Amino acid sequence: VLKPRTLADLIRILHQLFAGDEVNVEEVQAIMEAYESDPTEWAMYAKFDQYRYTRNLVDQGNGKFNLMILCWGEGHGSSIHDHTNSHCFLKMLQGNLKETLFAWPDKKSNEMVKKSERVLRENQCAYINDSVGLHRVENISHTEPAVSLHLYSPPFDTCHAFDQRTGHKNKVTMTFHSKFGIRTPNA
Ligand SMILES: [Fe+2]
């Protein structure tokens, strides 16, 4: 496995692996995982908020992907969401996230069904797309933060959030807390 020694190495490699038309999912996953999280390299992007997690743009991958860092305060979690027909890679940089995988709802209304539950380990890279299922991720800790590196290809700025009680869904426009280490207007 090609082991990037720095976040910068990993980004350069990513530009090669997404330069073409095909993407070897397991090759990407292994290389993201092989990178050893180093907070000196990504602390400029780790910008937290009191009440909810934040999305922090790192690189735009020449239109081919979004690379961003997500900052999970104590107890912070996401809704149940889809990924708008893209590849989605999630690598742990600090702390631990619990991923819960959900089946897709019918037209009927009722409780949503869990298909899988796991804790992502240190430096682990997970993979999901809409054919794998829906998921929710959350910080397992109420005393420590979590930080994750996400890659979305193609990039997207809208998804759906699902009500666990009924399976009903709403369209959600995602926003960035910061881009390239610079804070965006209005949190
Ligand atoms: Fe997700």
DSSP track, 72-110: E-TT-BPPEE--TT-EEEEEEEES-EEEEEEPPP-SS--
* Residue 160 assigned as binding residue: no
Please give the method by which this entry was determined. Answer: X-ray
| Rg (alpha carbons) of the chain, rounded to whole number | 16
Residue 126 phi/psi, 5° resolution? -105, 165
- Distance in angstroms (rounded) separating the CA atoms of residues 90 and 149: 6
Tell me the CA–centroid distance for residue 184 and ligand 1, in Å.
Answer: 22
Helix (H, G, I), strand (E, B), or coil: what is residue 47? coil
> Which residues have C-beta within 8 Å of that of residue 30, sequence separation ≥ 6?
1, 125
Angle in degrees, CA 99, 65, 17, rounded to 5? 100
CA distance from start to end of the chain: 38
Token duo for residue 97: 């996230």
- Distance in angstroms (rounded) separating the CA atoms of residues 1 and 97: 25
Amino acid (one-letter) located at 23:
V
* Residue 135 assigned as binding residue: yes
* Residue 168 assigned as binding residue: no
Domains of the chain: 1-187 (2.60.120.10)
Q: Tell me which residue has tokens 């965006």.
A: 184
Amino acid (one-letter) located at 76:
H
- Distance in angstroms (rounded) separating the CA atoms of residues 148 and 165: 28
Amino acid (one-letter) located at 157:
D
